[PDB]
């Protein structure tokens, strides 16, 4: 029994179903493969097309999933989609009324077109199953819990009719208990408030991280105007008819001005975040307290995008409402896609289920075999120096104790937003200066941002306060207090309020990552490491070996440990041996506006990526003429000939374009099949 | 007292407040001037910046209005803006939260800045008066009716808080009787339905045009699901949580699918438009039946953009609910901008009321003086031939009876959407072929819509059924039955139901134009002409002299009468003397897209207009090189020399671009200070 789990929109690699399709119209595209109830493969399309939280159809991810499972498309019994058919089709239909050129292709046609043109797979109509959205979330969250009965809570932006559903799960049966309509959405509330801090969709956990720096008292009475707790677990949010945003009109009237990009985070900003955080905590806990005592369950599964609010999860844990809590590593809409497969397998036959609580998120493609990895690292030889230690884990521990910041890339990539020892960046967790530098030099982001620790399972309760319910900590789902006599020891990973979004790694969770953390602690006294996602500010988590090295070279990381190979930057790297390649979304433009006295303006030259919210950059005329000659095979050095050779001026410009990922730079060839 | 009335957004000429600012965000920019209670001058900014229904700050409109009154900016006693401050500032705030790079400038600052920069006008805060939107509409509609008391009804898409408001008006006193909340919007219902017909904002008149071709019984039980008539002149529209459109989800669920660009109108589309129109007729007559009885009033003013529904107005006339009915020539938001002037004067000093009933929309800038116009037509010599008849109206009547189709440009331009004898295209109205001949050829549009008759006040009732109430017909506000006997006589101007959007011209509403239609009737026994707006498919009604000549040369009209001059296109006109200039929104682009095997793809060259819904055209490499060298002074022929001279190929390419108004082409210099 082999079932595919789908979610996302239906856009091709180089265009969107409608021009400039908005970034929130079916986001976080992914594919999941379940076999005999076990999740054997899952990857988000963002990892393969390098567009954070992409809406494009997860074609690549279906191809990679089938590969990991050793299956051909003809082997797939059923395909599940994470939304009912009428609903996605009504929203497609709306987009078409706004774009009269766009042909009327609805989701069934478009799914079948993409699979057949992209994989040579005529999918039979009888094998395509559409699924209620919060039902898909529920299966995902609950089946992987290792629990045979639980209260299941789903909160996200919105399914087809509800912003929240409450379920009773017993064995493999889900039974709806309650639902909350769309205009009461808490993910809608959080995203609306996020826009006031100069952020956008995808940034909600940055706002979460800012919250502890603020005082929730300043704006408590203001947020109080926007919601009302009612009897028997109910609540309302209070809308307006001015703008499609629940928060900004009231705050404007009270003198709050939205932050601008580039501007610092004032104390009123920090307090806004703090009150918003408190608001959602008050509502969800109000919900949960009710349905805890009403349904009689002592175990909770929390899912939906809101369950990535690890601060909220830490409060649920410490509330005494439950004895166990479980959160899926992908509780946002990629997880809903996985659950759509369970639900599809349920409607065509009986539901085979996992036999154990999900402990590892390490479910995407791998980096490659030993010999193809050595072969590809030889292709980067003009740019990198490679050592091959006897015991790479032992070496890396030593380098981490010496204050090196390491890139760490092993095995299959993590499903979901957190990195957990397979696409990580790690450093000594003890020096407070490691927070300030890794924020400013490495990940190149805001100074208030916290960093998450990983601790061995054996030493966890030596450092953190895991008391209360038993939560799963293999995926940094819970914010947890650092024990007060440890907060100075752990300067980098102890947040401003003495909490940390902790990861407890074990031999069973991640044998190798646990070996590294164990040895570091043998060497230093402190079995705890800083562990942040391996990606710069312009890309999702690195996936392939070429992704890893590109990110290593364009980030200020000291050394890279990839599959037992020690990689370091060469002194004088040779950029010219790299082969430029346009992304399907790369565009080159020469533009002239109007000028003085109705003249033509002076030429300018930009490179930009053709999706909603994609970056832009001015380029020099020499670089513009170079990039126009890109054939995907000529190296950068021979391309530069046509503009008088790769000057140092040109290399630096290319390099900065490379950092922002406007086009692929990587040696000739590729690593090959895996 | 001198009061300026403003409406529209705050964008400058070349950019918008936020990038690609939606075309519905405070549209139909305009400026009006009142002095001692009289409307001295009013021009929509669309005529001056040449963008249909523009949202941009009406700076040119204000320069034109001040000069028309012989006034410095400093002379003005108050400025009135057609929306409350906190509402426009809350919408601006919402735009700013979605574009975190936009500086936080709200309306009071933006208004002062556009005036300080654009007119050197240091506007003191004391003088800026924001106005309730539906109050603005009502003042405009009622003070020009020449009525001394009336029931005032405003229906539009929405103001700050309502979509419909009912007023009692006595002299200068406005008293509010009733409101209808935003989600009951009939403008909204209408505009929603228009998107299902392949059309968009500003195409509502076309949907009205199509509805008689259709049978409302088909989709009548369907629309009945979307609304309910309730007691006491109340109605409910029934929404949905699927999409921001009232109509599309339910119609998708029954198999109605929207038409696409360039698709012919099917019988389903025809019937849809018929049921839509019947519905808003039902609801609006249900509102009016109640408020006519409850207020007891015999007179009705009607305003807000829904009042530009000529067919609905005709049902109000033919209902026996009122004696008089009045509709202002600019009942859409440009009229709310004038009414904002009046309300500012009332809030400050006292409100001086306009003398009599408005009879003439001729309120814009004029073409120029006889010496100026003659001189500028001399600059146009390489392209036209000019006769100076002794009696132009006399000659023009002859050609009309001979069968020529005439451009007719006199005096000041009409305020509001209808051309009424000052920027018109006139023709014999008797031959049915004249429909397709003028629509589907010279103006290059669509021919399902009949044309509009202008009849003399004297013969008016010998041709049309003006019975029922006493409506004002000086602005084509009412659709009325064509008398059955004259139906065959008037083939060009009579619909499938026998009705006609009637202009009734009198010696007092417009002298020159009355003489013209009388004389034509003495020469033919039919004192009815066809009257359409002087504009092709890519422009609003022409304004300037150069506007009028440009439009004549890029359409297939036979003759042009402009201020007693008879203008025809030369045998071989010399394009090369024209000086091309960029419009502030013109962009010239060389694009390269992604290509096969990750290469740099296709080098296309494009000209486009940078605004929401602006046209785009591909250009040849030679045009690209030519256009990029436009400097605002050098002629087209001299510019063409840098690419081998103005071939017939290039001149056709350039001409086709001129038809679509990507550029200004006109002789060197201007007409001068008008
Ligand atoms: C993302 O962010 C937001 C999004 C939205 C709202 C908001 C935000 Cl923040 N929030 C806000 O607050 C908006 C603010 O308020 C505003 C822009 C107000 C503008 C000034 C106002 O336009 C007015 N005042 O209605 O203009 P008017 O000329 O008098 O009439 C025009 C009407 O008349 C009908 N109509 C004409 N001709 C005929 C005929 N021949 N037959 C039958 N119907 C006809 C037309 O069909 C049309 O509906 C509102 C309006 O309608 C817009 O649609 C044009 C609404 C569009 C809906 C939205 C933008 C969703
Ligand atoms: C202009 O057209 C619109 C606009 C809007 C709504 C709709 C339509 Cl048509 N109507 C819909 O039905 C949208 C549909 O359901 C979608 C896209 C569901 C996705 C999978 C949601 O993803 C989840 N599961 O959270 C996305 C969100 O909620 C998101 O916040 C991330 C908030 C979005 C608010 C929006 C997009 C306002
Ligand atoms: N850390 C967070 N806190 C609160 N809400 C969040 C958080 N992350 C995502 N969301 C909301 O979850 C919604 C998306 O959920 P989903 O459909 O599962 O992808 C959006 O409304 C997000 O704003
Ligand atoms: Fe969801
Ligand atoms: Fe209006």
Author numbering:
A (entry chain A), B (entry chain B): 1 to 674
From the reporting publication:
Carbamoyltransferases (CTases) catalyze carbamoylation, an important modification for the bioactivity of many secondary metabolites with pharmaceutical applications. GdmN and Asm21 contribute to O-carbamoylation at the C7 (S configuration) of geldanamycin and ansamitocins, respectively. CTases in class III, which modify secondary metabolites, adopt two nucleophilic half-reactions, the formation of carbamoyl-AMP derived from ATP, CP, and Mg2+ and the subsequent transfer of the carbamoyl group from carbamoyl-AMP to the secondary metabolites. GdmN forms a face-to-face homodimer through unusual C-terminal domains, a previously unknown functional form for CTases.
Unexpectedly, structural characterization revealed the appearance of three reaction intermediates at different stages, in which two different intermediates usually resided in different subunits of a single homodimer enzyme molecule. One of the three intermediates was the natural tetrahedral intermediate carbamoyl-AMP-1, which had been predicted, but not structurally characterized, in a CTase. Structural analysis of the carbamoyl-AMP-1 tetrahedral intermediate revealed the geometric structure of a natural tetrahedral intermediate in a carbamoylation process. The carbamoyl-AMP portion remained almost in the same position, while the formation of the C-O bond between the carbamoyl group and the oxygen atom of C-7 in 1 drove a slight shift of 1 towards carbamoyl-AMP. The capture of the tetrahedral intermediate implied that this catalytic reaction proceeds in a stepwise manner rather than in a concerted process. Another intermediate was 2, which was carbamoylated, but not cyclized, with AMP located adjacent to 2. In the GdmN/AMP/2 unit, the C-7 oxygen of 2 was 2.9 Å from the lateral chain of H27. The distance between the amine of the carbamoyl group and iron ion was 3.1 Å, while the distance was 2.7 Å in the GdmN/carbamoyl-AMP/1 subunit, representing the end of the carbamoylation reaction. The structural characterization of 2 revealed the conformation of ansamycin derivatives before the formation of the C7,9-cyclic carbinolamide group, which has not been observed in other studies.
